[PDB]
């Protein structure tokens, strides 16, 4: 017994009421007394506990006492029951009223009770099973000691016959769908039927009706069916009561990820309703509430174990395919090929998790691209997208512009899932920026606390053009890799001094041959030197943001030589392939083949990169995606996306800061 | 020195840079080395601290040393300055490079520095004065130990010549306006001018531009003027630098209260910008940020000291005016009269507070009412309103439907400012509810954590028809007063038994006389008894919510007799005036005169109410607003609104729960 409820005795009459377990009644006996009545006595049944409360002081009374008390407005009853009524129950309290002359009652008022248990239960303690009436089920708190139930957006697709994600409709087809859903049990105990005038109703708000759906599983003659009882255009469901000790099992799906204007928290209610009369609304005698938080979309840094390597290229790029295959064979990853840069630009593999279930889910980049990537939608492979209404899409909406750091600690605050990284332009610049709809979505997931970098000095404008992360083998540490033009100039000047100035660039690319690009020709180009000094300033501005926002020092960073050429917008495009954008499969790195100056018949860029990485136990494989095209103009011709295992750290164990 | 910044030496050249105090530089000397260089040495000036960092291990170096170190990419410099450059400064670091043959330098690279202090300061520690560089000025935290700067919505009006609140424009006229504003100081130290290519810029986001305005005070020849430098349609302002130790004083106004979609937090930034070249955006070398939270609109419970009593009635309601005047004379309050129920329905007196300033502010009820209450707008008397776009206004939007509890503790959680109370209908009812725009606004203030009650069983539909709060004189406690029909029936039945059944109701109201309403006539009306039993159920449902949400027991509640009659919508209107809606001026209560049955030439309702309240030290005055109309049909003919002192508890010392 916790909540006090008001049930008044009625003058001269009998009051019948449902008593919901976990509450108790305060009972006015004074208003029902006939005028002139002096004192009262009371009788009560075996399973009803009665106290007489005078001015706050309470006294327990026997089932049949003859004891009398003075009638006063400040003398009331407190009525309690610990167990549900059966058909063998008579649960009652009877009050007798006496005037001052004579010991025979002049009147009587009584209270007839039917006790029932009503509890809407969910797995609040997050172990995957639904506990009985968790007192914390009506709130949601973060952290290891945190509590409250978790809900997955059911964004995958169980059967291929439908083009759309499961959550797009109000229907369930396969029982396998239920495995993606959170269980909710309405537990009751009581007699064979509810007393006349009562019904039990499940309901949700209009606002939450596009955030959830709730199904009930029926097992009629011709086989299992799934009834949608709450969700889009269904705000309430009248429950069919069955007596004795009973449980109704419901399955809940999320329809929507957290977003701008939506915290991710939703509510479901059950009420016992009392019929008053026609034209009068039913009265909510008792209400129980459970809360769900919808699980966030979470990205995967390069430090996490690789599962599948997705690759796209034209069918004839052979060296690329052979070299990627060899790379993947060194690992336990599976290779998937589509016959070309989209897989990098249009998709980001994320994941969702709840205590009972989790699956990978694809974020699909905004269309400019007239069509979705939706052919990856399948069983336990989910899909989500955001499209702008007004705002126009630019190159910064491509997911080459979307990355995530490993876990970091910054100013004493840990980010166990790392931090999302997105390239942007300076605030006063008037430059490009990723669309608000996508930015709002990433921020709304909250657990990856996104950081904006400066990518808009690049023609394409993506963060993965200038930076990446790699593990340090045999440790729990990692390194930030940064593109560096000054590293390239230093190396080339060294090679020139060594007598190598005539060493030629892009050997084996026949479409570059007539250009005859040598170290000498590069170093003597004055405007190019100035362009790249400026680009190093851009890289260093990013370096400072990353050290600041990721809690990094110079010990955590390695510089890879890079070179750019300025276009007419004053933005950088790669002069030779960017080696920093690499396939990271734990200790094995697929690195884009640079095609740098040959010294003693080895690329000096390759040899320099090996000398930096190999002492760490990182094994380097250079991958050639460009020879099939016979030249390099600054554009990458293939794409790869690695799908990884989720973090072992549970997101709900994080404690993000107030918003 | 806290933040590390990257400044690279440039090959063969000299690099000039501004050094902002509170940062330090990491300096690459390796990239600037000529090819073939083996070792390096360095010189530096008196006010520049230089460390040689090899692989993380740092060593301080003398101003002129001859010491040489091996050139390595992992050997860098750490450069620090503790004081701003003057005109007498030469701040520099020079690096000499040596090859393996000979001790004369083969080249030199150098760093020329100008150190400046730049700090954007606000009163983060909330004492009313602007401290120097509070490290917490860039966040906002709740509570006694909390920190970060507070901003008032400047919603009052300094001069009458303009019809609108001060914040509606971009202009400031009177210097008195500045007193409503938060101070923000840009503090700097440095030489006579910034080095070539730099400028300092204040800025805000597009989003915050309708939330704030920022003025600078100039004192030219012809007198003081106020320049709007940031706000609506001004997102940035280029600052005029003056050398030496300088401070620029700015004044910040809030334009908007917290609301749906607006947390109340805003940002203002200062950046040092570096010019690169034409067509290239300027680079933000350094940025400092301050945060403001806009103060919430807060209501006043009846326990707070009364300041002014606002009253509206027709000019000839004399008994009302005389009796209200007498009541107010017992107190130190001032009476204000307008010559009629609006003042209760259309306005709610709230207040705002910041450490430097606070003033009362009126919430104006949504129009159905074709015109605002805006004639209360004046100096230090502010105004705010919310109007629906789509949703239609009903009687539940009237501010008789808007109240606030005294401070309460509920389940261990304290609500030091009390909790806002608003009447509504049951969730499945399809009944009336206050408009979303107003509800969203009240919820968004956060510090009064609003609760919805059930008012929609009443024809008018206001919470102040059935409940109120009064202090308990000579204590810190209070009572909830509840209308009770059962209390009325009990009293009338007692009077009937006493021989008083023929005692007549509404004596002295000539328009009621032909009805000849007596106790007998009331008690024998069967359908009326049933109507009022139902209304008591409605009252008791509210009673339970209040005890639950306010942490109240039966000891905290007193029932006042009331009676209603049902209309054709099954809603209640007062049968005789509702005594619970009363003027509370501390120990003195103006109570609506009930016009109840006369027994021994005293109203039995008046005598019953005195017997309940007077033993507590509450002094009762019955006020007659209806005799001037000769009858009572259930409508109240006058209105009163009491403006009170604010709580002494500062809202920013509260810690509300996560949202
Ligand atoms: Ca559980
Ligand atoms: Ca479905
Ligand atoms: Ca599914
Ligand atoms: Ca599934
Ligand atoms: Ca990506
Ligand atoms: Ca201060
Ligand atoms: Ca103004
Ligand atoms: Ca003002
Ligand atoms: Ca003012
Ligand atoms: Ca009010």
Swiss-Prot record, chains A, B:
Tissue-level expression: Detected in keratinocytes in epidermis (at protein level).
GO terms assigned for molecular function: calcium ion binding; histone arginine deiminase activity; histone H3R26 arginine deiminase activity; nuclear estrogen receptor binding; protein homodimerization activity; protein-arginine deiminase activity
CDD domains referenced in this protein's UniProt entry, alphabetically: PAD_N
Matches recorded under InterPro entries: Cupredoxin, PAD, PAD_C, PAD_central_sf, PAD_N, PAD_N_sf, Prot_Arg_deaminase_cen_dom
Residues annotated to bind Ca(2+) 3: 156, 158, 180, 380
Active site (UniProt): 638
Note on cofactor: Binding of Ca(2+) triggers a conformation change that is essential for catalytic activity.
Gene Ontology biological process terms, A to Z: cellular response to leukemia inhibitory factor; chromatin remodeling; estrogen receptor signaling pathway; negative regulation of chemokine-mediated signaling pathway; negative regulation of lymphocyte chemotaxis; substantia nigra development; transcription initiation-coupled chromatin remodeling
Binding positions (Ca(2+) 5): 348, 399, 402-403
Binding sites annotated in the UniProt record for Ca(2+) 2: 154, 156, 158, 166, 177, 180
Compartments (UniProt record): Cytoplasm
EC numbers: 3.5.3.15
Keyword terms of this UniProt record: Calcium, Cytoplasm, Hydrolase, Metal-binding
Result of changing residue 368 to A: Reduced enzyme activity
Function per UniProt: Catalyzes the deimination of arginine residues of proteins.
Subunit structure comment from the entry: Homodimer.
Name of the protein in its database record: Protein-arginine deiminase type-2
Species the sequence originates in: Homo sapiens
Designated gene of the protein: PADI2
